[PDB]
Amino acid sequence: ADAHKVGLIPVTLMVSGNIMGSGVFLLPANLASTGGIAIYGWLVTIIGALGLSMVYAKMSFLDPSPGGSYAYARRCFGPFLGYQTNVLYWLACWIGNIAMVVIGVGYLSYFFPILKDPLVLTITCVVVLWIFVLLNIVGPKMITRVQAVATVLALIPIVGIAVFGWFWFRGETYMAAWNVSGLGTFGAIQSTLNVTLWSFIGVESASVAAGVVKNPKRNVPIATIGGVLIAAVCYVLSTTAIMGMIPNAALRVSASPFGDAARMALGDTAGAIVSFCAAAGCLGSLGGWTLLAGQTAKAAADDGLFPPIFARVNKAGTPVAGLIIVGILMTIFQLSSISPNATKEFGLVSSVSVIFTLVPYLYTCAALLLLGHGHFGKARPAYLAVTTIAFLYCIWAVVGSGAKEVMWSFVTLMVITAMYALNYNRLHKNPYPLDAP
Amino acid sequence: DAHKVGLIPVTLMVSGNIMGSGVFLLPANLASTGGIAIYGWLVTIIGALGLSMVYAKMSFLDPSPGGSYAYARRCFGPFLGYQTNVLYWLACWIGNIAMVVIGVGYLSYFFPILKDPLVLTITCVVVLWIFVLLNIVGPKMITRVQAVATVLALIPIVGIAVFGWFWFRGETYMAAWNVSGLGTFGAIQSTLNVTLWSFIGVESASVAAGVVKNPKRNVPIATIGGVLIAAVCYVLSTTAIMGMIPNAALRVSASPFGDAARMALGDTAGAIVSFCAAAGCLGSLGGWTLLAGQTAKAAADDGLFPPIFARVNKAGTPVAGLIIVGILMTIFQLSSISPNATKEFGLVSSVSVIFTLVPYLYTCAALLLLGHGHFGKARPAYLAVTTIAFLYCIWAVVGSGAKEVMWSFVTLMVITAMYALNYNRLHKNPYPLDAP
Ligand SMILES: CCCCCCCCCO[C@@H]1O[C@H](CO)[C@@H](O)[C@H](O)[C@H]1O
Ligand SMILES: CCCCCCCCCO[C@@H]1O[C@H](CO)[C@@H](O)[C@H](O)[C@H]1O
Ligand SMILES: CCCCCCCCCO[C@@H]1O[C@H](CO)[C@@H](O)[C@H](O)[C@H]1O
Ligand SMILES: CCCCCCCCCC
Ligand SMILES: CCCCCCCCCC
Ligand SMILES: CCCCCCCC
Ligand SMILES: CCCCCC
Ligand SMILES: CCCCCC
Ligand SMILES: CCCCCC
Ligand SMILES: CCCCCC
Ligand SMILES: CCCCCC
Ligand SMILES: CCCCCC
């Protein structure tokens, strides 16, 4: 077993790369419609996200079980909520890969503009998705080595700006666009949170991958907190720097603010470097999220809470069949990129599936308290405060989401309940059974 | 069985809790679609009958006090028990606000000062406490009162559904077959958006099983009988009215039974209809308050709700829990003091209606997960009926407003946080961690 485990550095880079992914290069454009007051939103977000990372760090320290959220939910609420957690999270992992491959290949269209035709884009995205399924089949050491390189590459423009763009930063420029939302202070913060709360999806990555991590009781907590801290610093420093270097009006309209600012600062090679690095961050993220889909489904199947095919492994313990099934499913949904109307159709699916992840987060918070109270000792109030902050993070993210996406998430939970009952009656053990027939 | 409730009053509680305010307003709500609503009714009644059979069988297997709450606890454990009771308890007493406003509004036919929002609010508060006090007198009292109220409310509904056919004209009905502007499926969906919600209350006997005589026999009978009564009345009366009153008038009418009666057999007929419709709403207040008391008492008895809700007088009535519900309803009844206050409270009311479907969903799950050993050779029929019942619940949500469902989702999240923060160290885990 020990020979197929992933070390601390690649797992930390997988956390930070799964978090920062496609979004990091788009954040400044998204927050430009609010303005520099977004710094307040960032403060709230980073406190909530750190809180949630600490929950995952402590829960994984107490229980480094394969599958992360799934395992915790099963421990504290039982097989039905474990089943629910895995279905939601597995769906979120592979459905989110469609949007991500489209973005990463889109960045590559800077070099090969043929990649902007919907048909060529769709074929290319299917190819790339299978590349990252195949790298996962080679194994977790391969996929995390690939993602570690891709994540460092993607950090080049982000860290570059965060450290050196301050030489061009102007506070006059930042403050001239302090609040362009047309909203009062609370509304402007809310419009920020509508973006930023969703920027830390992936904080659970090491916890979910604990079955393939070396010394997980030590490394999953470090990688979780460290990955979140990398992302938080990168986010704040880079979005702040950009808003002080580029007038708000241009930032609003830019589809690639880092790349549009680079291509016009240090020349065309700079736009090239940025586009390449941003593609690398996206595509590496594909590898990591596919790994996580295979891992959640294997852990659930290993407990009899998902079809047995998802627990079938090769000699190294890789769920090869599960990874192939995810590849097929992603290929089918990837057809959505074939036209603008096809992509608009698939869009609601993508938006709903992002909400799915918050239920795993909510149950992990619950589980830390419900399972771990005997480990808090004198620090119990601290554990209660941090976990309450993490709960608020999750709830606030939903409060600010579109009503239609949350409604279809509600419906999905209902369908999962019916599926569990119809598929698992006579296998399910009841905490308070009726008397014998 | 000194304080236990007999079969007839329990059945009338089921039908009266279901029919309530809605029955007299259904034809006006369906008139915007037209007579094609008959298709929607057919779909709804199959689904509602399905759900009633699920409740009937589950209560037969386990006549536990609290109904849905007790079943969810049995099959999914304390957390989902906790969730089921919180949701259902909220739905019961929040739904009473809209209920009492409608009931007192019917009485405005006699006393027009009741349309002044201030007098309306004061009167509503008083009436809510009247029904809390009757529940404190006891379940035999509250169910006797609701039985009489429910028979009164049947007078106009059964009167039209039996004798309205002398005046029914198929021409009139078919002239407004489909006025929705939608194709057939869209028109059916516009119907379902109204009709699926018209069977809330099917669970009433199940939840009240702790106060019912011989509940293992009578709760199933009352569940299926209450639903059949409602279904017959719904279909007969809405169909009759649509064949008696031009669609245009049916649309603009705020009380189609009352407006049609007042202009059919005179002012005395309008007065009769208004009295009976008020009686039906108000009696419902008593039944839904009883159910709030019962679900909270059952959950508190298992340590899954604050213990004050399990405090009982010598008769076993949760007097303090009923008083707490009275207080909560009063505070929110303040919403009827102005049009703006009422619209503000409207989102809360719509949201809380969705809550009930989670108890339904879990009761469907519980029947399969707990009762599979009792199905025998008829396993397929169980599986089919329960599947119909699941679809009924999911479809109801699929057609609801997105904002209402979103805030229901948020409520589930809050409830999960509240459970974790209040029950850690008391909650026992199915797969615990090793000792520190
Ligand atoms: C992986 C699970 C994701 C489930 C997401 C379901 C999205 C449904 C798309 O909505 C469609 O259009 C309307 C809303 O836009 C609906 O009224 C209509 O019924 C539906 O067909
Ligand atoms: C009791 C189950 C349903 C009862 C049906 C009552 C009569 C059904 C009328 O049918 C429909 O009438 C429409 C208008 O005439 C036609 O457009 C449509 O084509 C026809 O099929
Ligand atoms: C226990 C019952 C659950 C309560 C449901 C609460 C609904 C609160 C919604 O707030 C209101 O509606 C808008 C969203 O719909 C908000 O944006 C706006 O600020 C406000 O006007
Ligand atoms: C041992 C494999 C070396 C990994 C190089 C791949 C980098 C991929 C950038 C997207
Ligand atoms: C046990 C005393 C019965 C009282 C019944 C009064 C019914 C009034 C409902 C309108
Ligand atoms: C070692 C192979 C990594 C290549 C992945 C790049 C995807 C285009
Ligand atoms: C040895 C360096 C590890 C640091 C992880 C953030
Ligand atoms: C119940 C479905 C009816 C369809 C009529 C065309
Ligand atoms: C016996 C008292 C009945 C009161 C009806 C509202
Ligand atoms: C025998 C009395 C039991 C009561 C349960 C609340
Ligand atoms: C919600 C009411 C609780 C009362 C506790 C004493
Ligand atoms: C027995 C009296 C109850 C009071 C609760 C507020």
Author numbering:
A (entry chain A): 5 to 441
B (entry chain B): 6 to 441
Reported in the publication:
The L-arginine/agmatine transporter AdiC belongs to the amino acid/polyamine/organocation (APC) transporter superfamily and is a prokaryotic member of the SLC7 family of solute carriers.
AdiC is homodimeric and each monomer consists of twelve transmembrane α-helices (TMs) with intracellular N- and C-termini. The significant increase in resolution in the presented high-resolution structure, allowed us to identify twenty-one and fifteen water molecules in monomers A and B, respectively. In summary, we suggest that binding of L-arginine to AdiC in the outward-open conformation replaces water molecules H2O3, H2O5, H2O6, H2O7, H2O13, H2O17, and H2O19. The side chain of W202 (TM6a) in the outward-open conformation forms hydrogen bonds with two water molecules: H2Oα and H2Oβ. However, in the molecular dynamics (MD) simulations, the observed water network (H2Oα-H2Oγ) interacting with W202 in the AdiC crystal structure was disrupted, allowing W202 to sample a large range of conformations. In contrast to W202, the spatial orientation of W293 is stabilized by a hydrogen bond to H2O9. Therefore, we hypothesized the presence of a dynamic interfacial water network and placed water molecules into these Fo-Fc densities during refinement. This resulted in the identification of eleven water molecules in the interdimeric cavity. In all cases, the thermostability of AdiC was significantly reduced, supporting the importance of water for dimer stabilization.
